[model samples]
Target: GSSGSSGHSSAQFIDSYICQVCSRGDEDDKLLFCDGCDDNYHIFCLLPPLPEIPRGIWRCPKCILAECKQPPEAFGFEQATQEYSLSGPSSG
Candidate 1:
């Protein structure tokens, strides 16, 4: 029985989304749901730092390298910061 009455206007869609790495539910930290594992992980919770939501089919981290034969856009994080000290890893 937990209740704190705020305005009902803002009290919709409270799925209580939280991150696995950072462990926060702050209104600002918008969590990203993993398609493979259903666990929520946000940007800062990540070491590489993502600029925005990843485009198309975002899979998990560990098993991706050895298991999946997809693009290695993960390393591109260093590329972006280094040039600006900046970088996106795909063109064609």
Candidate 2:
């Protein structure tokens, strides 16, 4: 099950150290803060590693709670690279 790696059942990627978000033990994936909310995102997933801490704060799309804040940046190349989506009857 590539979608489900040996390391974690919920992670899109795995690492050597633990994940602060899911509490999974893996650190190879450098953790980053989402620009919209307070959730943590994987660094390899960033469009481009922050050259020097972006001018504005970061928030994860999943954590965005604002009603008027511009939508978080669209998924980047690596960020949009997901292993799989939870498919069901609606998937067809």
Candidate 3:
């Protein structure tokens, strides 16, 4: 039913999606979509930086700030291992 190719041409797709930060479309750079706000973001625009495009859902700064409770909860030392653990331990 499909050619397995993008329905729109490269130029068309590039024109369709605009970066929320720079307000321009980058045909070469990969874009990320925020699940919370449905806004498109360039990898370079995000603060704290992401090493690579994430495979899972991403929430934008606006969404995170909106959902954050006042006086954000601090993580205790007990959560250190769980928070940073990559092994068999389940994260809390």
Candidate 4:
């Protein structure tokens, strides 16, 4: 129901990728993936992609401090930002 007759040449690929979090979809998407957490997200969804992301173990706010026991760089948002309570027993 979209495409106001601009045709395929005018369309862009960035519009199609949906957010891994929040699950919001629409046109003119500006995705900003967390290098630490491989989750795909609309740039606007977060505080803002900024000129540069914060240094040292950049993960989504949700997955911070989880005992995934893996290098933060290799984990995706699903792995990196997945929720876990540090206070819980058996830190696995």
The whole-model C-alpha lDDT of candidate 2 against the native structure comes to 0.50
Model 4 steric clash pairs: 37-77, 38-76, 38-77, 39-77, 63-81
Candidate 1 vs 3: which has more lDDT: 3
**Relative to the true structure, how large is the alpha-carbon lDDT of every model?**
0.63, 0.50, 0.71, 0.55
- Determine which window of 10 residues in candidate 3 has minimal summed lDDT: 74-83
Q: Which candidate, 2 or 3, has the higher lDDT?
A: 3
For residues 4-88, write the lDDT of model 1, one tens digit per residue: 9866675556557777776777833556767656767776666576776677767556445545666665454332433441365
Residue 86 miss distance in model 3 (angstroms): 37
Instruction: Tell me the TM-score of each prediction against the true structure.
Output: 0.45, 0.26, 0.52, 0.31
Candidate 2 per-residue lDDT over residues 1-92, each given as its tens digit? 36544664475764334334455435434555565444455544444534443445666545554444656875456446557767654654
Top candidate when judged by TM-score against the true structure: 3
lDDT at 91, model 2: 50
- Candidate 1, residue 36: the lDDT equals 55
Backbone clashes for every candidate come to: 5, 13, 0, 5
Cα shift from native, residue 44, model 2 (Å): 2.9
Model 3, 13-45: lDDT tens digits are: 334678777887753267777886678777787
Worst 10 residues of 1 by lDDT: 77-86
State in Å the error of residue 70, model 3.
Answer: 6.3
Backbone clash total, candidate 3 = 0
- What are the RMSDs of all candidates, in order? 16.2, 15.2, 13.5, 17.4
* Decreasing lDDT order of the candidates: 3, 1, 4, 2
